[PDB]
Each structure stands twice: as C-alpha cells, then as structure tokens.
Design an enzyme around this catalytic site. Sequence first.
Site, mmCIF file in Angstrom:
data_model
loop_
_atom_site.group_PDB
_atom_site.id
_atom_site.type_symbol
_atom_site.label_atom_id
_atom_site.label_comp_id
_atom_site.label_asym_id
_atom_site.label_seq_id
_atom_site.Cartn_x
_atom_site.Cartn_y
_atom_site.Cartn_z
ATOM 1 N N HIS A 1 0.820 -1.201 0.000
ATOM 2 C CA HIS A 1 0.000 0.000 0.000
ATOM 3 C C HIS A 1 0.856 1.253 0.000
ATOM 4 C CE1 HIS A 1 0.905 1.084 4.154
ATOM 5 N NE2 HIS A 1 0.819 -0.204 4.427
ATOM 6 N N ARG B 1 -5.524 0.521 5.288
ATOM 7 C CA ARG B 1 -4.676 1.090 4.256
ATOM 8 C C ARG B 1 -4.384 0.064 3.171
ATOM 9 N NH1 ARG B 1 -1.852 0.431 9.210
ATOM 10 N NH2 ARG B 1 0.312 -0.249 9.172
ATOM 11 N N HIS C 1 1.570 -5.188 3.141
ATOM 12 C CA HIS C 1 2.451 -4.225 3.775
ATOM 13 C C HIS C 1 3.899 -4.628 3.500
ATOM 14 C CE1 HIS C 1 -1.025 -2.787 6.209
ATOM 15 N NE2 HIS C 1 -1.405 -4.040 6.083
ATOM 16 N N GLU D 1 1.008 -5.506 8.759
ATOM 17 C CA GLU D 1 2.288 -4.874 9.032
ATOM 18 C C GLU D 1 2.883 -5.449 10.303
ATOM 19 O OE1 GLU D 1 5.122 -3.626 8.404
ATOM 20 O OE2 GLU D 1 4.249 -1.965 7.324
#
Lengths: 243, 243
Positions: free
Chosen positions: B10, B61, B185, B88
């Site tokens: 992202h 995100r 991520h 993440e």
Amino acid sequence: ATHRLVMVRHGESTWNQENRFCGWFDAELSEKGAEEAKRGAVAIKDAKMEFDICYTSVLKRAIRTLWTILDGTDQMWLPVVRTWRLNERHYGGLTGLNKAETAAKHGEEQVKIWRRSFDIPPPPMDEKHPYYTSISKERRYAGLKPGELPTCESLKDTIARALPFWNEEIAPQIKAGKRVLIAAHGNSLRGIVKHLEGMSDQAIMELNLPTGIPIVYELDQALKPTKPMRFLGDEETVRKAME
Amino acid sequence: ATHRLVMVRHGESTWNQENRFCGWFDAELSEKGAEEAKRGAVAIKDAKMEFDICYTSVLKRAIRTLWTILDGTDQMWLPVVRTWRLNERHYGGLTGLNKAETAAKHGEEQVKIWRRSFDIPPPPMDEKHPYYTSISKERRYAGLKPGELPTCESLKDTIARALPFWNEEIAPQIKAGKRVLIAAHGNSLRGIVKHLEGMSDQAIMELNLPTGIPIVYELDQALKPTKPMRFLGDEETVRKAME
Ligand SMILES: [Cl-]
C-alpha cells in the site's frame, strides 16, 4: 429473539434512471445511489451495529453498497463472501431495453403479463443479444455447474437459486452466533424475506424493499422472525419506508 | 515459468507523513497513498492482468489499496480473503510515537539496534500503552489462538506468522492455476519475497519494496521464481523503482 440479521438493497443504478432493465448487466451506482449507501452506513454506525460476516452478489452496485457500509462503520476488515446466487433477477432478452423498447418489441399486454407474473420468465438472452458475450460468457460465471447459468429468470427462478445459498451458507453462520449483513438486490432479498416470513407468491410480489435503507430482522433460534422487519435511519426516512 | 503472482505494498498512510510508527494501528491512506493505489490499478488494467483471488490484511490502508485496484480493473466481483497474518509488523510500545519521541523515550543507540536488527523485537505494548485497548483488545483479533496475538514483533516474528498463511492458503491456490493478487504491507510482503527468493536475513532487510507499484513474479510449478521481480507502471515510475 436470539439473532439479529441486517439486509440492504443497493440504491439507484445508472440504468434505473433510464428505466432500463439491468438484471445481470453490471451497472454502476448513480450518485444518488452512492449517497443512499452512505446514509445507510451512517444509520448502522449510529445504531452501533457490529457484524461478523458479510454477503453480497457479483454485481458492483451491490458490492459498492457493501464497501460504503464497511467504510462508514469502520468494518473494512470483515470477511466478505460474494455469490452469483445473490444477483438481481436475470431479465433475459429484456436486458438493456427501456420500457418503451420492451413494449415495442414484445407487446404491452405481454409485458404486463411478465411484470405481474411470479413464474413466467421473460424471453431468453440468446447468442444474438447485444449483452450475451458480456454476461453469459463472462468469466465470473465460469464456475457454475452446467445447467446453473440462466438465460432468463422468473422471480420463482431467482428465489430458487438464492435460497440454497441462504440454507447452506448463511443460515449456519447465524446459528453459530454470527451477526450477518447481506447487501444485495430487491429480487434476491425477496427470496430471503419470503422464506423468513413464510409469504405467498402474491405477497412477495407486493413487497418493494426500500433502497439503501437497512432492514433489521430479529430471529429466534430456528431463524424465524419474532417481530416485523424494522428499517434503520432518520425518522423521516424510516416513516416513508413504512408506507 | 507456469504461474504469475502479483503483490502490491500500500501507499503512504497518514502516519507515515508524521514519521510515526503505525504497525497495527489502523491508519488511513493519505491522499498521496490513494493516488498511488489508483496508479497501480491503471498499470494492472493496462497490462490486461486478470486475477482469480485476492489476499489482504485486516488494516484498511491495505484493504483500501485492494479495493482501488479491483474498482480500477473492473474486478470488484473477485473473492477477497483478509488475514491478520498479512498485517504490518507490530511495533509494540513504539506504536504511535514519532522518531524524536522514540529516541527520547528509548535512546538513540538502542533505537538504531532495533531498526537494524532482524530478530530483536521492540518493547512490548503493555496495558498502559495509549493504543492497547484499540489494538490488543480489538475484536478483529478475538479469533486468534491463545499465544498468537503479539505484544511486539521483530521482523523475524512477522515473517514467521505470515509464511504459514502463504504455505497453507495462498500456495495451494497458485498451484491450482489461480492468478493471485496480494495487497499488503512492506514487512509482510518481505516474508513472502524472502521465501520465494531464498534470501538471507540481511538481504531481506535491504529490500524496500516500492509503494503502490505492482510487483510481478513468474513462478515455476514448485513456486520458484524463474526470473527477477518486475514492476508494473509507466516507464518513469518503473525506472525509479528499479533503483
Ligand atoms: Cl471486499
């Protein structure tokens, strides 16, 4: 009452403005329809309603309605399951025609019969139809078992292919205590309503579910509603839908 | 080469602009990050790349990046699977601190050790941390088996919880001929890259995957890459990423 189920019919598409039969044509939401989805999202957020799993169709007007709800309620992380079984009714050869074109091509009395019938399908979408390749040959239907892809559907046909998804996929989740959201189409939601309420064929054809307005059911342990459906939203929006 | 895999990191979040450790804090895309997602969508559409199934994290995100790609490529109907295993890295007690705050609270040399280490975790997120309730107690992690919810992660830890998802869920889909998209991520994608390429711990810490830029792998039947990763996009965007 033991379980809460929420359903939402998507808002206006671009073709609804043209009074054009969309069906399995993958029409976009209009601006008005997107605003309706946002309104429903606000109502769900205000009611503090959490979901655990969401179901939608393979048609973007419904998927986008779901996405708007998930964004507006901070539930973008929820599991989402898409199925053709929640698609709008397949309008067959009427797909892409407006009301005047339909009447000119098929006859006013004939179109009235189709509009008011539960079980007489519209004409088939044949290989010469302008939308045949983009619907009947579209890869999102390539996994259907032979015989499942319709050329056309009566309301009876639509309900008959929606209900198995309810029985086999959605109902076990509810019974496990999951809070379900279904974002779909008037005619596919009609199938679920008909089943939940034990309604006749005539009664279901008289029900026009409001658009973008969340519909809340409270169900007992056997998934039978314990009270009438309720609408979520501001007072004025709800009063109108109650009419 | 038999199978094509596409991955996307992202774009910029709101906290990346504040040089603030986000980790499992569910930061929104910035405007720039949303534009990066749209750019990647255009590149995928231009390459006529179809997918069959998509994977993402439980962090918006990444999910929003996926949604932007699906919208821009007319693939909103595809199956989507979300997993915390693609999240993440969990930055532990550093979550929500900027670089100066981190250094003031923990020491410059100590922070350098953590930044350059593969296997030393940052401090735990404890019950007094401002984000403890909104991360560690958040209902989206309530299904994790006891012992799986981290208080903090080294890169080694992140990779160790991402790889099982690759091995058990993603890899069998690829071997069945499905065209996979993963929107996630940097650090979770690093785990997959490390495995695909058989890279050392040091080598993976030197790889900073470009943001919003689709990364294409061609894999043999054993899922081994047959050539280097390639980036999708306009010439100038790709040339920069190659640096
Ligand atoms: Cl989704």
